[PDB]
Amino acid sequence: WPPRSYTCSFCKREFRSAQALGGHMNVHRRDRARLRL
Ligand SMILES: [Zn+2]
Helix, strand or coil, X not given: CCXXXXXXXXXXXXXXXXXXXXXXXXXXXXXXXXXXX
């Protein structure tokens, strides 16, 4: 993802903070799982 806040490419959530971002992906965890990197 690009800098200047982060957005989830699944539910379109907003979070500049990595604390919210990292945890937010955990609540998804559906299919793909890294895919390649
Ligand atoms: Zn994400």
